[PDB]
């Protein structure tokens, strides 16, 4: 198929990656950048991430999800699915709003493209309504991470797709954290796409930190997976 050929055929071997993101939440403002390296052939992500201005007022768990389904592995019997490497190389935008239960929200507008060999998440990020003691501006989030399947739907309408999910972050007091996922994403250019039937990707993420790091950071490890086409 000379479209499942194309997009695809630039995400064969390990692709560099660039990510930037300038945040305002609440009027905390801040920026980071991330680097490194995705293999989609094996679902793979490798990520290390700086907060260039300091203190990150938020916790680096409430980041992860907008922090590249590009690099999500599909299965043989689903490249017919792949909306996200259809885009490529012009990219696609994605959008959302992250409803933190009892707390604020986060609404993202992210550029995921091509610079020459690098792929580049250009990312900004708005917090309103945040609590400036609660869970998310009160740095109350444990550094970890839950695995959590993620359902992609087709909208033929606006030529892209719908993304749903719940994240359950775990808070210090053994309790959990509410974050409900509401996303778009659109190509940028103006040919055609992969619109996908209905299917999830199943995300593993595990956060660490550089033992030579002095900055605020987060190293970023993800598997992602496309299923439930059998």
């Given at each position: ?18 990510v930037e993101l ?11 950048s ?88 250009r990312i ?107």
């Amino acid at each position: 198929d000379p479209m499942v050929s194309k997009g695809e055929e630039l995400f064969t071997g390990v692709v560099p990656i660039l990510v930037e993101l300038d945040g305002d939440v609440n009027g905390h403002k801040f920026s980071v950048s991330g680097e490194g390296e995705g293999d989609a052939t094996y679902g793979k992500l490798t990520l290390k991430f700086i907060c260039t201005t300091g203190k990150l007022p938020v916790p680096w768990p409430t980041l992860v999800t907008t922090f590249l389904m590009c690099f999500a592995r599909y299965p043989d019997h689903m490249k017919q699915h792949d909306f996200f490497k259809s885009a490529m190389p012009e990219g696609y935008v994605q959008e959302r709003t992250i409803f933190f239960k009892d707390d604020g929200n986060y609404k993202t507008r992210a550029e995921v493209k091509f610079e020459g060999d690098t792929l580049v998440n250009r990312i900004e990020l708005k917090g309103i309504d945040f609590k400036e003691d609660g869970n998310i501006l009160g740095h109350k989030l444990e550094y970890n991470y839950n695995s959590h399947n993620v359902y992609i739907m087709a909208d033929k309408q606006k030529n892209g797709i719908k993304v749903n999910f719940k994240i359950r972050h775990n808070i210090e007091d053994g309790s959990v954290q509410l974050a409900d996922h509401y996303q778009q994403n659109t190509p940028i250019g103006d040919g055609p796409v992969l619109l996908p039937d209905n299917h999830y990707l199943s995300y593993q993420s595990a956060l660490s930190k550089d033992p030579n790091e002095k900055r605020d950071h987060m190293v970023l490890l993800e598997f992602v997976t496309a299923a439930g086409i059998t």
